[PDB]
Design a protein around this nucleic acid. Structure first.
Ligand SMILES: O=C(O)c1cn(C2CC2)c2cc(N3CCNCC3)c(F)cc2c1=O
Ligand SMILES: O=C(O)c1cn(C2CC2)c2cc(N3CCNCC3)c(F)cc2c1=O
Ligand SMILES: [Mn+2]
Ligand SMILES: [Mn+2]
Ligand SMILES: [Mn+2]
Ligand SMILES: [Mn+2]
Lengths: 669, 669
DNA sequence: GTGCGGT
DNA sequence: GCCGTAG
DNA sequence: GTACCCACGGC
DNA sequence: GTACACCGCACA
């Protein structure tokens, strides 16, 4: 791993802790060959304030640094054997780079605290993006070159203060770490604390607001918007043909999302499972996993492409219904949020683990979710207990069962709640006084065979009894189906209701609805959830109708001047011929006909065949049809209750085209 | 990594060897746990024919199979002890799988031959030439290939004791010649030896034309061609900014080349190393490896575009210059050969290992190379040694020196020769009567690092005396420069003369100039190569000229149609007004103006803009000059010799523009 | 024991 | 201990 | 082209 | 994220 230096007298030495490997062997040619040692960390390291001392003492990066430090840790730290008087921490200049920073610091205050004081702790000044993508000496000259390199020694100033920060930030009290976050939510020396409060604040945020949280409008995280905008743009629409995966990842990684390949493929892969997603936004072709936890074949071996329902996610996008922004480097654009013409958030659900928070939303039945909004339009002052009159509860893709209106009903209420999910099981008598236990629908997010290696574990472990055999017989002809053989005399129902206890045959969805609303992290309710979506349904379908307006009048102006042109044809054709530079002609048609630049230019673009019979006539046939569209579009605008209908019209056309009954059963009791 | 059936009874039990990891995983999921137990193969196996036992045994894919079956190797063999009674070999309908299928066959015959006799050794028949096993679902893998209902298998029959041993020997044998020969000669139950022949052969063939064998005409292998083709389709010519490596490959792979991004990358990557390619065919961004032998960066982190010199490989390609082929899936088109407006093969070099053969080709200096072409183009009866007044021999990007003319000399005569690559070390003074050797240039293809290490390995191992320090001091200024101290008052030149014959300071280039000629593996001497090249160019300029002409012949024609109307215009204006459709309007213009169907449209489709003064003379000015062009072309076509000097000039301008000094120094005595 | 496109 | 996007 | 670490939060 | 191991030649 490490690459060491010739000078074995620490003084003229120093080690660089450099983020990745891509940037690690770059640095392995920029670096001086006799005064500069490199230690490539292989990825985000252990937290030393979360895990106890036997763990710390193990994660390889953690060990690897100790020896390579020489000083020895804890209370054996002889800062004398200190191999380096200048240890540089050269983390990428991204968020996961300041984030890797805090993690090394947390290790260098509790385990080499004298080191910080000593005067060896450093922070190279990488030029701003990305680390890896630099040359070997492009790495020497800005960062490892003493002649030109900008560094940072970490002054531990007030140990009383730091001692208190380091616990809040990397401590086990998630809730402390949030309170700070929420409060600071604005949208040649370096003090160790002056570092953390920023180097973690930026990360805490960007993770919350540009990683692990699904917007409230499209119900989408970024890595998803960017996979569904790219299917969009690359025009791999459902009527067309599957593209290989690594080609869309190729496209998406390039343009919008500078991150690992793995993160993007496995992400679009989920969007592609009839069991993961309630309403799959991807057409998977090729091996795409299975319920046993198996993973889609590698991105080079599969194909995807939009789904019919995905269009509704991006329908009317090009009519200016949402704001585009430059991408990451400013060479491309991307949607800030897609149209989401259909209740996507609650429909498909969500799960993500943040920094301060985490979110968990269940998948609900679209049809149910629609009436919900439908009713929700006709009454801004509606009660959840009523919204729930249209929305029985979530509906998992795994069907399965749900217990009580009660676990369900609090979630929606207050925002957080607990739902007990349970498998579809049946007892059936095999005669001769015998029994057997046949699950056909496990719960949602429940790895099939690991529930079975889980019952396998019990039976061989004599922790539960009276089961003779355990077969998976599941066929893509029967649906899920776990047959459990029961012994004679021994009671099965017993063995059933103990398999709910002891195994995932019964599991619980921890509803906790933190979605990104108005830009920030937010716990919300069923009412709130649809309200802010219905809002984005008003705020799309409106902005469109106005673009159609604009796009409408714009054409009827060009037409106006066009008909005038066909009506005084004979003079127009000579006022051109008798004009040399078309700059002059544009100057004629205007004065003589009371016309406008955009109009006289247009005429000067008219093709001879636009003068035949139909083509002439067709033309004015287009005009009188536009003015119905125009007044209408304005009718639509000058009466809320109309635009509002369009919304209901459309939200209902959807519910009639894609709606599907319920799979999950809500059992009352 | 074998997922064994619950079943413990051979008569019903059948193992599966699958092509990939992925293939394997789908198989494992669409398989019957009851009776179908699957052992996947990670890539390639071992040749138990070419390799000897200590080595076979210590190998994995064999042992893995050995335990699986649970029978025994060679004499230990016992038909009863066998876990399974169907051993199914599942590789895909791709040559590479054809050959793997012939690699496992090897095993079963050399070690479990008796096993074959019982009929346990089976072959699986996936759908033909559709795709990689891995593409299909697990359900798609069961329904066509594994389900006993609709599955077709080939039972391997050992027909003749006598011929089988020899055949296996020949195809998988140590002796190259007999495999080279067999190939060339050939240029339910299944007969195993007719199967080892065809599927091996079917494979061996692809690996030549469409694998690791440069074309004579463009110098390019399928893999590079393919990268350079698409570079030019994406349109990232040197003038355009870099665009990530991931996008590029994902693309070449998703339009042309069905293989490992890893293989595509490090191939594309080479093209971009100024020390790899005499004239780099790419222009990278970030870490693209370096001399001492560090691989390149991760295709995520890098960017890439053509060189200005690559522009000339794809000059005039969309001008009907060379035939087009359909891509592996028939969903896109690709060039069968890049136009190569410069002699790439002998320029950049090339060196792969095929089947029964292998090419190895040096680099030369473009300037030299062109001059030889011009002179040979001039004297098509020119003596080889007359070509050497122009072409003195190779020229490695690394530079260096060569040792003697008969070395180069017989290389260019029989296709093959041995060329002495030394280095340029200088001896000089370090101070105090103490000396030093200094090496500033290494043999091409020599790895600077492994050269330095493998010198210590001879001092430490006291196999070379008087060496008292050796650093490698290569910076960007020094370029290459390695220092070797000589214990003063000791003959530095006697060491240097030994380090030469001991290590990689001096290396043998074993030239075997083979490359696809008239579509087959040929051996060509300097001339043929130049000729084959030369003829390509003669056959390109002509076709371009053929195309530049039907394009002018076609545009003059129209330039007229317009003129015509532009003159007799008011009546033109009338014919159309007085007409109801373009149909009549045409058919009217066509006859009552003598206008061609073609010219008629050209007017029907003419904007008013061209009624003015200028626009009527921009036509005029354009029409006349198209006559002076067709003049030229009709001149260049109608003569074997102008077509021949257009080439000479056109190449005489490349050399003029991209041509450079010699770096490798040619010494004798 | 090594170059290069392949599983 | 695992739900999922990032080193 | 897959194996083997980490964070981050809730239950 | 490097480790990991194989076909295929020819020539030291
Ligand atoms: O595309 C590639 O570069 C590789 C692909 N594969 C798998 C075959 C597709 C590899 C597999 C390797 N192993 C699997 C077989 N036994 C262990 C080693 C390997 F070492 C390297 C590679 C590649 O470089
Ligand atoms: O992009 C990714 O999925 C990964 C990237 N990296 C490095 C950051 C690029 C990893 C590094 C890992 N390590 C394994 C050995 N011990 C610590 C580092 C790892 F297990 C997984 C990954 C990835 O999955
Ligand atoms: Mn980064
Ligand atoms: Mn990963
Ligand atoms: Mn294949
Ligand atoms: Mn590889």
């Amino acid at each position: 791993k490490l690459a060491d230096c010739s000078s074995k007298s620490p003084e003229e030495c120093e080690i660089f802790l450099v983020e990745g490997d891509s940037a690690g062997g770059s640095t392995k040619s920029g670096r001086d060959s006799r005064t500069q040692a490199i230690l490539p960390l292989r990825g985000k390291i252990l937290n030393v304030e979360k895990a106890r001392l036997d763990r710390i003492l193990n994660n390889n990066e953690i060990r690897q640094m100790i020896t390579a430090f020489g000083t020895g840790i804890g209370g054996d730290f002889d800062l004398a054997k200190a191999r380096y008087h200048k240890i540089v921490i050269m983390t990428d200049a991204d968020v996961d780079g300041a984030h890797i920073r805090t993690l090394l610091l947390t290790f260098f205050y509790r385990f080499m605290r004298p080191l910080i004081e000593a005067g060896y702790v450093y922070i190279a000044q990488p030029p701003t993006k990305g680390l890896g993508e630099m040359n070997a000496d492009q790495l020497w000259e800005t960062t490892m070159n003493p002649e030109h390199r900008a560094l940072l020694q970490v002054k531990l100033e007030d140990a009383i203060e730091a001692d208190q920060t380091f616990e809040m930030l990397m401590g086990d009290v998630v809730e402390n770490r949030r309170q700070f976050i929420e409060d600071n939510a604005v949208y040649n020396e370096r003090n160790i604390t002056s570092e953390m409060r920023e180097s973690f604040l930026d990360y805490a945020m960007s993770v919350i607001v540009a990683r692990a949280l699904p917007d409230v409008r499209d119900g989408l995280k970024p890595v998803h918007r960017r996979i569904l905008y790219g299917l969009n743009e690359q025009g791999m629409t459902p009527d067309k043909s599957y593209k290989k995966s690594a080609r869309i990842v190729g496209d998406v990684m390039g343009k919008y999302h500078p991150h690992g390949d793995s993160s993007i493929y496995e992400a679009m892969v989920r969007m592609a499972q009839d069991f993961s997603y309630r309403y799959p936004l991807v057409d998977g072709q090729g091996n795409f996993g299975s319920m046993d936890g198996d993973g889609a074949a590698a991105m080079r071996f599969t194909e995807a492409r939009m789904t019919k329902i995905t269009l509704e996610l991006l329908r009317d996008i090009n009519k200016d219904t949402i704001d585009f922004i430059d991408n990451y480097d400013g060479n491309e654009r991307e949607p800030s949020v897609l149209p989401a013409r259909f209740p996507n958030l609650l429909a498909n659900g969500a799960s993500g683990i943040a920094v301060g928070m985490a979110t968990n939303i269940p998948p609900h039945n679209l049809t149910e979710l629609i009436n919900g909004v439908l009713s929700l339009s006709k009454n801004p002052d509606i009660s959840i207990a009523e919204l729930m009159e249209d929305i029985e509860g979530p509906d998992f893709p795994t069907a399965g069962l749900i217990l009580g209106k009660s676990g369900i009903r609090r979630a929606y209420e207050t925002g957080r709640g607990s739902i007990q999910m349970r498998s579809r099981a049946v007892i059936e008598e095999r005669g001769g006084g015998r029994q057997r236990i046949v699950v056909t629908e496990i719960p949602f997010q429940v790895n099939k065979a690991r529930m079975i290696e889980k019952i396998a574990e019990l039976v061989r472990d004599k922790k539960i009894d009276g089961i003779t055999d355990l077969r998976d017989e599941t066929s893509l002809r029967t649906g899920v189906r776990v047959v459990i053989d029961v012994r004679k005399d021994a009671n099965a129902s017993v063995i059933l209701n103990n398999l709910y206890k002891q195994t995932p045959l019964q599991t619980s969805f921890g509803v906790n609805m933190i979605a990104l609303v108005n830009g920030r992290p937010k716990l919300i309710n069923l009412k709130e959830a649809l309200v802010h979506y219905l809002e984005h349904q008003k705020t799309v379908v409106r902005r469109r109708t106005q673009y159609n307006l604009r796009k409408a009048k714009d054409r009827a102006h060009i037409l106006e001047g066009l008909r005038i042109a066909l009506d005084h044809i004979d003079e127009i054709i000579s006022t051109i011929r008798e004009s040399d530079t078309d700059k002059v002609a544009m100057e004629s048609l205007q004065q003589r006909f009371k016309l406008s630049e955009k109009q006289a230019q247009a005429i000067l673009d008219m093709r001879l065949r636009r003068l035949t019979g139909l083509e002439r006539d067709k033309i004015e046939a287009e005009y009188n049809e536009l003015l119905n569209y125009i007044s209408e579009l304005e009718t639509i605008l000058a009466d809320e209750e109309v635009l509002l209908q369009l919304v209901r019209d459309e939200l209902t056309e959807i519910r009639d085209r894609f709606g599907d009954d319920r799979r999950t059963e809500i059992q009352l009791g």
